[PDB]
Design a protein around this ligand. Sequence first.
Ligand SMILES: CCCCCCCCCCCCCCCCCC(=O)OC[C@H](COP(=O)([O-])OCC(O)COP(=O)([O-])OC[C@@H](COC(=O)CCCCCCCCCCCCCCCCC)OC(=O)CCCCCCCCCCCCCCCCC)OC(=O)CCCCCCCCCCCCCCCCC
Ligand SMILES: CCCCCCCCCCCCCCCCCC(=O)OC[C@H](COP(=O)([O-])OCC(O)COP(=O)([O-])OC[C@@H](COC(=O)CCCCCCCCCCCCCCCCC)OC(=O)CCCCCCCCCCCCCCCCC)OC(=O)CCCCCCCCCCCCCCCCC
Ligand SMILES: CCCCCCCCCCCCCCCCCC(=O)OC[C@H](COP(=O)([O-])OCC[N+](C)(C)C)OC(=O)CCCCCCCCCCCCCCCCC
Ligand SMILES: CCCCCCCCCCCCCCCCCC(=O)OC[C@H](COP(=O)([O-])OCC[N+](C)(C)C)OC(=O)CCCCCCCCCCCCCCCCC
Ligand SMILES: CCCCCCCCCCCCCCCCCC(=O)OC[C@H](COP(=O)([O-])OCC[N+](C)(C)C)OC(=O)CCCCCCCCCCCCCCCCC
Ligand SMILES: CCCCCCCCCCCCCCCCCC(=O)OC[C@H](COP(=O)([O-])OCC[N+](C)(C)C)OC(=O)CCCCCCCCCCCCCCCCC
Ligand SMILES: CCCCCCCCCCCCCCCC(=O)OC[C@H](COP(=O)(O)O)OC(=O)CCCCCCCCCCCCCCC
Lengths: 72, 505, 46, 713, 63, 96
Amino acid sequence: GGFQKYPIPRYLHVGQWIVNKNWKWNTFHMFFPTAILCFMVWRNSMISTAKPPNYGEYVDPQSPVAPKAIKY
Amino acid sequence: MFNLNTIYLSRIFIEFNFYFLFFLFLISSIIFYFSKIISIQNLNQNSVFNFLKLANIFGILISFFIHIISFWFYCIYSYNLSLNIFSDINLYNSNSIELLNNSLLPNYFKSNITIDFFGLILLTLAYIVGFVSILALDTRLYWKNIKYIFSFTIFLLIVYVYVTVSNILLFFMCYELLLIPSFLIVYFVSPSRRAIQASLYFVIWTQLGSLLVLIAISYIISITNTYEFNDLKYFNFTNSESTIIIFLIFLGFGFKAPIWPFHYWLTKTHVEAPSGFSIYLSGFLVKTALYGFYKFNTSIFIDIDSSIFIAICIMGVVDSSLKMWGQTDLKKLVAYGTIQEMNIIYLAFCWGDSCAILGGILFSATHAFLSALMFFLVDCIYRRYHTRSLVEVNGILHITPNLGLSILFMLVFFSGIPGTIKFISEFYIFSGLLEASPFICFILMLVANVLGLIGFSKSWFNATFGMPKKNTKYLPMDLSFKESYIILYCFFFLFIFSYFSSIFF
Amino acid sequence: MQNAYPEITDQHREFLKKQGLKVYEPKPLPDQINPFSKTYWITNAF
Amino acid sequence: FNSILFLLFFIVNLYWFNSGLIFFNSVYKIHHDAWTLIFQTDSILNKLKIYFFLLPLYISSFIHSISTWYYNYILNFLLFSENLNTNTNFVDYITYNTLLLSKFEDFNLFVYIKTLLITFDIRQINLDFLNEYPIILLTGLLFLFTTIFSLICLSYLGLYGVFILNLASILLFWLSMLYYFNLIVSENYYYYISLGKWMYLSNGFRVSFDLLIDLTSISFSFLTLTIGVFVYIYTFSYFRYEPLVERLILFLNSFMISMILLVSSGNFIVLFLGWELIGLTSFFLINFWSTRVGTLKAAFKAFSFNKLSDLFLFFAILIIFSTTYNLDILSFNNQIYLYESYNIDMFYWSINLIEIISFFFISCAFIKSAQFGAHIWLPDSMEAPVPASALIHSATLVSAGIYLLLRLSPLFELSKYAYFILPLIGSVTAFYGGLVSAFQSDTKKTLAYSTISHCGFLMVSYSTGVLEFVILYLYVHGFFKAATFLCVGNVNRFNRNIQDFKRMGGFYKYLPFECLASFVCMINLSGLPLTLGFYIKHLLFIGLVESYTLYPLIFSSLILGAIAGVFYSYRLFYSIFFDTKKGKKAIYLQASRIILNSKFYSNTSLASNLSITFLVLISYTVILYLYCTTLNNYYSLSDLKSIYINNAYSYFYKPDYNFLNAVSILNWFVIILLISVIYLNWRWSYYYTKSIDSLSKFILFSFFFFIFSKYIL
Amino acid sequence: ELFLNEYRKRINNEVRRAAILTPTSSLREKMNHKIADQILDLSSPHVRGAHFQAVRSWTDASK
Amino acid sequence: RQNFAKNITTTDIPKDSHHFAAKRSGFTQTEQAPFAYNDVYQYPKDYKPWNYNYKGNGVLLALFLGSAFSLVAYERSYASKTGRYQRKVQQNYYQI
Ligand SMILES: CCCCCCCCCCCCCCCCCC(=O)OC[C@H](COP(=O)([O-])OCC(O)COP(=O)([O-])OC[C@@H](COC(=O)CCCCCCCCCCCCCCCCC)OC(=O)CCCCCCCCCCCCCCCCC)OC(=O)CCCCCCCCCCCCCCCCC
Ligand SMILES: CCCCCCCCCCCCCCCCCC(=O)OC[C@H](COP(=O)([O-])OCC(O)COP(=O)([O-])OC[C@@H](COC(=O)CCCCCCCCCCCCCCCCC)OC(=O)CCCCCCCCCCCCCCCCC)OC(=O)CCCCCCCCCCCCCCCCC
Ligand SMILES: CCCCCCCCCCCCCCCCCC(=O)OC[C@H](COP(=O)([O-])OCC[N+](C)(C)C)OC(=O)CCCCCCCCCCCCCCCCC
Ligand SMILES: CCCCCCCCCCCCCCCCCC(=O)OC[C@H](COP(=O)([O-])OCC[N+](C)(C)C)OC(=O)CCCCCCCCCCCCCCCCC
Ligand SMILES: CCCCCCCCCCCCCCCCCC(=O)OC[C@H](COP(=O)([O-])OCC[N+](C)(C)C)OC(=O)CCCCCCCCCCCCCCCCC
Ligand SMILES: CCCCCCCCCCCCCCCCCC(=O)OC[C@H](COP(=O)([O-])OCC[N+](C)(C)C)OC(=O)CCCCCCCCCCCCCCCCC
Ligand SMILES: CCCCCCCCCCCCCCCC(=O)OC[C@H](COP(=O)(O)O)OC(=O)CCCCCCCCCCCCCCC
């Protein structure tokens, strides 16, 4: 199926047929910290999220949340 | 809540950083001259060349840190000064605060320091680009040109006086001082034999524009005996005098900041100059001309149509973009890119003191960093692969993956992706030009960002990709830590400077 | 700033309330999202 | 120095401290201000008793006072600010704060510990919280950071590590997307998220990095992500035993996230960023075979076209910003009608503002959707590996123009240029792609030209102006095109990278799963009667407008393109699988050896088969959900935020005899073409006479069966 | 000039708020009010959005 | 070229002297003389040339302390801008 494997120089930092013995722990220590970083980013961004009203809700035109035109 | 302490700290930092640099240079020069009978390197581990290199590098770096602090102090000071002037409306009250000078160090050239955002941006560019170029020139300085280790310190001092002075004559003299060190570097440090002729072309082409600017300065000084750079408010030049001054100023400063057709010297010098000095030239030495043009044209009142100057700038952009395709030499291709970016920047200054200056300043900064990145990549390619020609170089990525990745990311940044000061500057300039002349804006954008971009990308992609089957015994290894971190710092600045305070942009 | 939408009457508001509609009202940030919350800082420490 | 003794002492101290806290709380409640009168009584015996019985409280207060003193000192040292509230000496401060016990008035150790424990409790999370705050962002960031960090740290993550990490991230992202798909499409849920103030774009302007998860965004996002999950699962088998599988996987993930960002863009700046990112990542995928310079030529062709599209998009955005001092998508959509009447003074002509803006947008959309003239790069982009080709050609790269039109529909509704150009170019592209695909001989080229034809049909559907029909067409085409691409990829891998079916024959037995999967996928893709893909073309012809000046050419091209599907589907399937064996003897012999006979025997991958099966099942389910939402009697689709009503649904709800009989013309054209491709003989065979006889039998039996069904019953 | 640009930015933000809060039905009906008139009245001649120079006579600058 | 001294005194160079051995008997009349120095570089086990091999907490501590200082400095700055000795946390915070 694939091409025949050929030697790769040791000194060269290349990805040809690279397999790591400790890939399980590497994945463990690369996934969870990334998940925590994304959780922090998500909770930071949720402060500036906007959603339309729900099914049973209507926006009162005179409420502060309702859009307001500029007053010269 | 702004207080006089911040004002005095800003002024003291600005004044004392210059003397820090000057004392470092003076001590290093005294040591160099009085340690040896003949001022050349002793080829041994105990040479003074190591001490001089250390002193220059970590004087520039520490002065750069102090410059960061002083620039931040200046930003706060200028913002609060504008607030103090603007806020109060009572007719009896007026902001008249007078500052007394320190008694520790004197005022260099008996001049009171005045600092602006554009000047400090130029000074920051000087610091960073000088640091990169000095890091590059280590392999070039050997045993008879070690005296040129101080060239960047001399450049820093000249630029410091250039940007922290309110005197027209001192301004012009600082602008004109830059020629000698640059010519000496190109003449004595350039490996290629064609550098000898390239240096002469550089000198003559730049000196023609220097003479033009000298004529303009003579017109201003002889007519207006003032030199304070602010008394010009009370003197108005007639139409003929004003048109002569603007023409002379534009042509003279465009000789330095390459414009069509005056870029033959730039191409020659970039091709035949040291790879470490090309970085400094393109990054910084062509923007002192822009700063001087801005100062003079905003000080003088001009009642002429700028269509001719805009046409010259646009023609330069178009010419460089069209010629990009036909260059197999990476250094010459980067030189054409520099010409294109500089012409766009110069075009940004063709509407006097309008809002185009902000885009021009931002584009000057991004072009400095981008040109430094590109010339450093060319330097790495030439130093490890002993050629900088597309025909002789191919498949860089497969033997030096980091270098190929750097080339690819350099191309992406050059394309002007959002999130980069390059994109921000393009947005500023094109947003203004669309209303100024939409058809001209379309032509400029089309040419520069399609035809020139494709010509630029063809050579770099061909070099990066392919299969390096030739001379397998002589293939290099990879980038070093120094080169890798320089590339990373260029990328980091290009990305993060977009978060700089928007008050000044 | 001034109201942009056309005004409605309190009688109309009461009619809508009887019909069963509710007035849209922004809700406070939950303790997990609130950055000034003991829950938020406990999460940070953990 | 015993751990057991330390633990026992700690537990005893905890119990004593808790009891003291409860006692102090009760006494403080009773003696809010008079508690000191008994706590700090001058009596030596009482003082000693109180100190002994509240030692845990006193030691805790002393530790708290010391910590607060040191913290205040640190803050003063760092900030050059004030004193510790006052200038109290160390001894006075520490004594006062240690004697003071009111700090424990509302503090209970057990309650505090219980609160700390329940803070992390996951039982609390509810659907209502998820509905209020979208977790789509959390998972998309997870996928993005996983891809970026996996690219950087390749040595740490081997082949298996990269695969598993990205698989987990992408699965989580897809599950969250699936959860929110139901709410966004039908429940009228959409979110506008902002990450921060990205950049300054004027003297006092600053655009924020905002995302818009609306129906328009989710329609593309869920399709791309669902296709990408199975393409990702399939790639590990297609690039099996290749030097660089991690690179291909990470490139695919990068392209997916770039397209997701583009579709779910909150403002034109984010849209342009996503545009450039998909262009760059598609370039990398096409140029995956970096060693070859032949691949670089196709990559550079695609790069040049993408840069042209970027120019057009950038110029359009600049025009919009100059007109309205805003880059928000919602604001632009709701404001463009006011400025519709405006004109722009260009070199020597006064161009209508809407017309010029729509011209640039349509130009970039055509370039990225591979319409006629600008499609030249798509056939050459097939140099990419089959997974990359499937992802780019199904719903990721070739649907960018469709997304642009759908998102900025209010602009194009008032565009004369759009009205004239979308149907004509769409129909011409449909006809051209269909016929070229029918006459094509290579599998990937056939799929590419079919993609061009379907993009033309999508343009014509948008011209008709039923966004629901456009979305349905997009979903059907994307799913089934991706599935067919995966099947042909397996076929090519078996045939040793020979993509032409002139060297393919009798592969039905060697690739049993591929044969049947390709049959289903192709009958659905090529609009054929009694298939899920017939309704998209039916609705397109229902909605086709008739006021065009070039209506004759438009309609004829549409008919020819629609019929062209049958020929390419038949040729591909039959030539690949059931034709005479045309391939090299080695291909068959190497796999026909008896030694290989085993329960594990297969010429494809089990993971690949499962991925294709699940993709087909999920595509069927999602298409059925969309059909129920839109084409049902009860219309339950979410708001499209467009005020242009086309009246096309009238001929879907209450069609008239004229239209009902008109559709029969195309139906019978397809029937005759099917009969031709089936019963037509091009080569001598032992079955020539019997084939003619079978045709006669079929004709006569069809006539009699119709007679009995209609009249005799 | 920055203040007029700020007016334009604020009205654009209010339009975005209206779009998110109000469904497409009645959205244009409610926008055909003070808000639409202000959007048009804050056009390029009156506010310098991104143009290099706001061409103002000395009387306009004084105002 | 390089002129620095190889034999440093800050530390002793890791080396292995057993990989290469010098012949000292059984020579012939045509064989060249052996070599005097036959020590080879020996790397520490568990050294991975493909990463930084950095095991110190100095950089992380410096970055974390900088971030914490920035946080507290911003807190104090906000209090000063609001004209209070400390932040006045509100009872409810809304999206914005
Ligand atoms: C070989 C390179 C070649 C380069 C030249 C070529 C260039 C072009 C081609 C490029 C492609 C080719 C090269 C790539 C392959 C390299 C292969 C290789 O070398 O493998 C080894 C390499 C190193 O790993 P290793 O060798 O196994 O071990 C190293 C040590 O063990 C680690 O020791 P440690 O554990 O003690 O860590 C020390 C420290 C690492 O120390 C440093 O790197 C010093 C950094 C000093 C500051 C410089 C500016 C930083 C700007 C932001 C970027 C941060 C750096 C991350 C890298 C860039 C982004 C990808 O780690 C940290 O603490 C990370 C925090 C950094 C944050 C600093 C922020 C400063 C202020 C920035 C501006 C304001 C931001 C406001 C944000 C507000 C809230 C959002 O592989 C990696 O691990 C790759 C890491 C990639 C970055 C991701 C991890 C860090 C994430 C930080 C936070 C950001 C994420 C989201 C946070 C969300 C919450 C806020
Ligand atoms: C699209 C383009 C994409 C391009 C990028 C693609 C991705 C590229 C990925 C690959 C490259 C990047 C990621 C890997 C980087 C390398 C990470 C690594 O681990 O390398 C190992 C690398 C090599 O390891 P090595 O050979 O062992 O060298 C070690 C170093 O020389 C030194 O190590 P050390 O252990 O000796 O630590 C030294 C440390 C020493 O650390 C410490 O001292 C901390 C602990 C003491 C705390 C103070 C205690 C005082 C009281 C005493 C208490 C008792 C003692 C406590 C300490 C006990 C000992 C632990 O000193 C410092 O760090 C000085 C910094 C001071 C200024 C800044 C921080 C302070 C701010 C202000 C604070 C104010 C509040 C505090 C006030 C305090 C009182 C005044 O070491 C480092 O990580 C050094 C840091 C810099 C590394 C290079 C960073 C490159 C970043 C590139 C960013 C590019 C961004 C591009 C963005 C593009 C966006 C479009
Ligand atoms: C604070 C928030 C998060 C902060 C994170 C910031 C991340 C910034 C960007 C990091 C980019 C890292 C690139 C690493 C490349 C490593 C080399 C490699 O992959 O192999 C090169 C391959 C082969 O490399 P190789 O195998 O020869 O060598 C690998 C090992 N080294 C390099 C160390 C020797 O060569 C190529 O052909 C070049 C391919 C380049 C592909 C780049 C694709 C990037 C796609 C990113 C998509 C992100 C979407 C963002 C969406 C949101 C936008 C707002
Ligand atoms: C009228 C007053 C005139 C004043 C004239 C000033 C005389 C300056 C003489 C310089 C002599 C330099 C060599 C000193 C011996 C070095 C011995 C050594 O290497 O052992 C390691 C020891 C100690 O090393 P360490 O291992 O302890 O490292 C810590 C270093 N310090 C102490 C600085 C934190 O000496 C040094 O490291 C000193 C290095 C000196 C060179 C510094 C070069 C950078 C640029 C500054 C140079 C001086 C210019 C003036 C200052 C800048 C401008 C304000
Ligand atoms: C591009 C050429 C090749 C590169 C080298 C550059 C050389 C040229 C540099 C620019 C010189 C200025 C040209 C534009 C002048 C515009 C004003 C003008 O003259 O209009 C009539 C002006 C403007 O008139 P006006 O009509 O606008 O208003 C005044 C009208 N009256 C007087 C009637 C009331 O009229 C004059 O007063 C005549 C002035 C003539 C000055 C010409 C000589 C200038 C000498 C100094 C510069 C010499 C530089 C030489 C450098 C070396 C060359 C090798
Ligand atoms: C005149 C009446 C009005 C209608 C005007 C239009 C007339 C019909 C035009 C039909 C054009 C069809 C072109 C198909 C090209 C397929 C190319 C291909 O893939 O290779 C050949 C494939 C076979 O591929 P193959 O791989 O099996 O073998 C190929 C063999 N060689 C290369 C030697 C040819 O398919 C065919 O051969 C079938 C096409 C030929 C037969 C066409 C019959 C047309 C019948 C028209 C019926 C009209 C009904 C009335 C109503 C019509 C209007 C509504
Ligand atoms: C239907 C979606 C299907 C797909 C879901 C995929 C998983 C998504 C990630 C989990 C949910 C995270 C958002 C929680 C929202 C929330 O706060 O919801 C609210 C609840 C509390 O309810 P209240 O705030 O309403 O009182 O939050 C919690 O209970 C927080 C406990 C932790 C929740 C998981 C955190 C995941 C992040 C990584 C943790 C790493 C731990 C350490 C590893 C070494």
